Amino acid sequence: FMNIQLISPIDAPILRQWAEIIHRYWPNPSQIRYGTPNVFGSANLFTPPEVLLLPIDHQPANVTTPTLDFTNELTNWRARVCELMKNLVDNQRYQPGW
Amino acid sequence: ANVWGVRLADSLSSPTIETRTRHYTLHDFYSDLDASVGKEPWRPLRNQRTNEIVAVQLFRPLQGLVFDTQLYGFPGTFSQWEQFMKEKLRVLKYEVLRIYPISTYNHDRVNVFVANALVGAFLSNQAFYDLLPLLIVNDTMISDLLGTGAALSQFFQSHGEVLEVAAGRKYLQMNNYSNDDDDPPLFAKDLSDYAKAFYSDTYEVLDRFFWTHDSSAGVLVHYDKPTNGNHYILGTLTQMVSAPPHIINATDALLLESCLEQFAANVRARSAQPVTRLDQCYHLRWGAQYVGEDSLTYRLGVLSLLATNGYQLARPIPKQLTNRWLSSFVSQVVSDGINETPLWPQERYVQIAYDSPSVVDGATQYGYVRRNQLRLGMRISALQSLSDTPAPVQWLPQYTIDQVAVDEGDAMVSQLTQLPLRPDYGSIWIGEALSYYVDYNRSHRVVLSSELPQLPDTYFDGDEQYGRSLFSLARKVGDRSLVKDTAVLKHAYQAIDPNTGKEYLRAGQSVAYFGASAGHSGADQPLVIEPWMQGKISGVPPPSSVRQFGYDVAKGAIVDLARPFPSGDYQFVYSDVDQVVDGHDDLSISSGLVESLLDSCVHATAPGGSFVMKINFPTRTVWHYIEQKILPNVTSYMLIKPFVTNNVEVFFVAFGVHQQSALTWTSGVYFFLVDHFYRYETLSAISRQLPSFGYVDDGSSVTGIEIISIENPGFSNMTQAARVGISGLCANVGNARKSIAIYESHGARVLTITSRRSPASARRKARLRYLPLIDPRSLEVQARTILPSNPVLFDNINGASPHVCLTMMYNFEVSSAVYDGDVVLDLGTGPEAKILELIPSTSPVTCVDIRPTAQPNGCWNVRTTFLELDYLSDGWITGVRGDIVTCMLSLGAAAAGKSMTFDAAFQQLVRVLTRSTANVLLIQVNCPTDVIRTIKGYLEIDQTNKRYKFPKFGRDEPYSDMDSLERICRAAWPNCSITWVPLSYDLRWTKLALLESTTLSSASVRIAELMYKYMPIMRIDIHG
Amino acid sequence: VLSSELPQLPDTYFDGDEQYGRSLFSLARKVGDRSLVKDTAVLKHAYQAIDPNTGKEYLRAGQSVAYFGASAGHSGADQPLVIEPWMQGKISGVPPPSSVRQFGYDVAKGAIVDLARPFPSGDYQFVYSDVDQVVDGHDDLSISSGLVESLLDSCVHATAPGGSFVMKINFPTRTVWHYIEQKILPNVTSYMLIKPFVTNNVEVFFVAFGVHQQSALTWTSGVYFFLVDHFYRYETLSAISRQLPSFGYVDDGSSVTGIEIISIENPGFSNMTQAARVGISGLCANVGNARKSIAIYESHGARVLTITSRRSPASARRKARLRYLPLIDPRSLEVQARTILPSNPVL
Amino acid sequence: TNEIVAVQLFRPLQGLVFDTQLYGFPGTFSQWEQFMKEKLRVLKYEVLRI
């Protein structure tokens, strides 16, 4: 898994491309910068003060009337998972009874 | 040298002239926004092994492609892709021209961030209309984006005098990109987000901003001439996967790509062409508390600092980068090894040394410090990469004054050999068969049959069969029987009869053939029959009809040729039947079978005709039987020898059968048989000392091949051990031809040296006392890639030249003349002394040529003396002590150089040799011995002006006769014993040419003998 | 003449501006193969020599020559490109030799040796050497001159007397002249030193004929005139090359020579205004009667014309001549109703 | 027919003791030897990294 060369595409193309999807499309960490250390100086340690850590990306919104669109890393992740599972179910040798 | 992979020492360079920047205006944006066929804002990248477009590098107007690839939905093929881009950018062009009139907005600068974000939003259909008022800039580029009020966080957002902006997509991936080993690396610049570049105006405000901001992955600065103003770049935590053995993250890939690009730029600096930027290195600024020592980010920071200072890589980089090359470079940089350079990566500022050639301090106000403390001892020059060769090239050594012990070099070469391998053998002897003939004369001598020699008794032994089978397996021919038959017929149709005057054999002959064999990879007959019938030999007339008999016919009949059989009477009959098949491996039954074949071939001859008989094993009983029975019934005869394979078999040809006469054997036939048997003995003694056909070599053989293979990292002065090993190989080789090859083997730059040993080399190794050492400079300069080949034992496939063969003849004469434990002296060796491989080990030498030598001074067991004082002159030979003087292939050269006659040159030589203390002497003289045939293409004489005119060498020399030479010798000494040594018909000189692993010839050794008869060597003993 | 009277290199030779001028001229001068053109020139001027002893000439056919300083890569065969046409007689001012062997650091069909101190080889009747003092010399005139002396020693001892040799000299200094006058000229029948001129540098060739005969030869006033002409030629052409812009420059207007364009628009048939006439006349006063080319084309929905020409120091002198800026007759541009497609500008 | 129907093996690949289904080689000789060259090059990079 750490070395993508050791998965051969002839034997394991599905596992190789799922590994590539994990290596490239997994969500990135970000920060939000809460608080103030002027009064009640920050108790953050091993991090700088006035910062939080978030395991997913965060851009802030620009409007106050929210609607639906399709541009963020979580919907991208769901799209890639559904894309690999449709590449898996389209193959007939893996489910010959269907 | 090196840090962890070798960098190019002894030089460092950097570009000098930097281009002045150009503001990007609206007319330039329109001209880039439409795509001309001459220039367009995308350049295609292509695969190396297939020449297929697999990636696209992007440029200035389309660089805001930060969204996911699914949001755009490009087609996968490059032509459809670029057509789609041209159409959609033309739509965007019409939109922006509908917004802004060109005639009033021609000469105002446009905003780069808004331009890139506008292209990226229009390609993604993400409400680009609120960017159009921000396209024309005012009061600076950055403050409009700071103090703007349009809310769009997909591209930029302000934090108060610090603008952040998501850069993305320097490269673009196509569908056919498949992470192949020749695909170009993209350095993680094809993802959605690899970094977040934070722009501002002052680095103090940037450093105050990064107090509360994290610095986990580490930030990167640029400090030379940034893209759109002074800024930092913070990479995210995404990975690069298109490099197989190890995975690196984003800022690692950015620093690696810019370090390799600066390593590219340091080589191509020519001090007159300008570059767009003096250094592209990043020099990480805050993350060094998180990435520490021996990590890859730290080591690439070290290499980034070295690239900024202006070092060069020891091995050349390609024009287009490949994943294998990138993998090999990073695998070289993560290894063991200390930082040998004094340059250490700092944190406060990027430092440059005192004598670094970079001039980046003058074109930059903030960032660089000329540190006067540390210095770099290497000189300033560019890189000079020599052009590689596919074939291995010859090397010659040059020696030094230092010296070590012999056993140390023997131990080092035993460490460095790859000697247990199987070399390709080659071929001992190439060409057509040599022909040795003798015929009966009435007036020579009558001799008895018991006086003629026979086979040696040690003939069927294991070593003798080994030598004959080795020579027969290594000697390369076409058809043995065809070459033998052409030789015997061309020497058979030369005979004339004493009764009439014409000849014996004529056209329309009605011949018979005995001993026919079918398989010859052609027709099912011997291959001489149809060309001899069609007259293609052109030294023969064609016969009338050919019938073939023997055990293995295909178009004849099978009989037993011993006792008779129903057939006709044939006017000529040729026999090829041997005494090996029917004879049961003993000389008595073999001789009786010879007698029976002679009886049948005499009774089947149709009298008034001729026959040819082959004899494998000529013994005394065979000679006695043929002398008693055949010779009184034969008019005349001849016995000849075609020489293709080393054996004692001869041919017997008799002419004019069934007439009563009196014929015996002659002294010329006796001389021919002695020469034949001694030739067999010498060549068998040579063939029993060679290794086998398909051997592997272990080092114990007296002749063979040996190699070493030691490695050399980049440009480096090689150590003591490598020099000792190569010099020990040179002392083991002894001035044969030496070929080298430099090539990368399994991730290591290594060179090999391939040459051969000889018994003459072992004699030279026995000559010397201390092992001398070579000058390694001629190998240290080499920066090529010399691809090797598989080793062979006999390298010369075209054969030896007749000058070389003549030289080996004179060398055998010298080595036969010189005894053991005797002082000698030579006239005219050259830069190397070949006579050191000729004289024995205990015999001291003092040679002289007009040219300075290359053999080393000192380190010998016995006395050797080298001096250069024009030996033909006078006043030097008084102190010189010697017993025999040798002048080989140099007296005529000195006579031609002085432009004087050969008699006067020889007289001056004998006048200066009268003062010496020698008593025996042999020198090479230019004298016609036989009548002149003026050899075409190798020695064309001048009869009038008496010159030689060698066409292969372009030289000519005077000569005179042996009468005049003997006259001056007897005028010099009254008691001198003049003699003329004959040539070697018995090939006794071939020892030095075969044991030193050289395929000789056939035609060139014929030409070498016929050249030796026109310039022999005389020997003078002044006493007796 | 004495050897001390002959000139040498200027001391301001390895400076930044001098290297800039030489690298600019070498990057801009367009050729085929440098070594091929140099070798054709030196052989055509070498086979014209006649000897004073006999009457024919020095060099003839069937010569058995040697080659020093061989390089492999020339985008052709793996040898210098003069060898096989000179062997086949394609030059047609030369006779062909008998055999050519090639030595040097970068051979492909020869052997690698160090040409400074001797080495095992034969004796060649002619020998042409290029070994240069840049690679092995460590960027100083003392070691360069000593390496010249060592190459002269090796090339004299490897000459097979009664023959000739050709030596190149990159850096002809007083020590080199003194050494060759003391050692080589008493052992040489006659000589010539020539110069093929392809790249702006001070390197010359030395050709000597008839080695290893005792005679008395010195330098002459004609050689002195040739050396003065050579060094002053280098000085003038370097002074010219140090005033040009660089190879791939962008132009900002501060350069004394270069190119400049303007691009003003003209809607249909119209008498152009005062400002366009002033601008085009100012460009004409800045150009100063060089060739001027125009192009009329629609650019982004606007009919526009460009004017492309070049400036010179003579143009700056003419701009310094005059007092008031005169104005052109715009009629020859007002009549034009074509569509003249432009091209990219060249210098 | 002069058709490649079998392959004789030598010293480095002689430990092929498992069943043929466990390996899954392609049937044609050219694709087979190309697959072997690629996968042995991967093994070469692994052992040289060790």
Ligand SMILES: C[S@@+](CC[C@H](N)C(=O)[O-])C[C@H]1O[C@@H](n2cnc3c(N)ncnc32)[C@H](O)[C@@H]1O
């Ligand atoms: C003479 S060589 C072949 C030479 C071959 N025909 C050529 O000239 O190219 C060997 C042949 O001699 C034949 N042979 C040997 N002893 C014989 C015998 N006693 N009678 C007849 N044929 C014999 C064998 O049948 C064998 O084919």
Ligand SMILES: C[S@@+](CC[C@H](N)C(=O)[O-])C[C@H]1O[C@@H](n2cnc3c(N)ncnc32)[C@H](O)[C@@H]1O
């Ligand atoms: C072709 S070689 C012969 C030596 C060697 N066997 C060879 O074949 O190279 C000619 C040699 O004769 C020497 N020689 C010619 N004339 C000479 C002279 N007058 N005094 C001393 N040596 C001379 C030269 O030094 C040269 O090495």
Ligand SMILES: C[S@@+](CC[C@H](N)C(=O)[O-])C[C@H]1O[C@@H](n2cnc3c(N)ncnc32)[C@H](O)[C@@H]1O
């Ligand atoms: C003489 S110049 C260039 C010659 C030019 N390439 C030609 O083909 O005529 C430099 C070349 O000489 C070669 N060379 C051989 N021996 C040399 C030496 N002792 N000193 C300097 N260069 C030497 C180097 O390998 C280098 O490629």
